[PDB]
Amino acid sequence: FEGFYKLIMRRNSVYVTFIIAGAFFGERAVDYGVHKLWERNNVGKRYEDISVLGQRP
């Protein structure tokens, strides 16, 4: 990990920016994965899957 150390950990400002970026991107990735699991587990039960949606007389 010493090569990554020489680019990210030599200065605390870069390290802090790396932490900010990791929070942003990792939270986005986890959100996407959780939503994928949610969709895969609830097939057919969504509002957008109502057969008669738009068809109330």
Binding site: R11, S13, V14, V16, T17, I20, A21, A23, F24
Partner: peptide, 28 residues
């Protein structure tokens, strides 16, 4: 000539943190 580089690094950090709290992607 290191205080200027420190200021630039911390400015980049502050900008990154700003875009991260407020996330103004629908406004840009």
């Amino acid at each position: 000539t290191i205080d200027i580089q420190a200021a630039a690094g911390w400015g980049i950090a502050a900008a990154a943190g700003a875009i991260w709290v407020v996330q103004p992607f629908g406004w840009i």
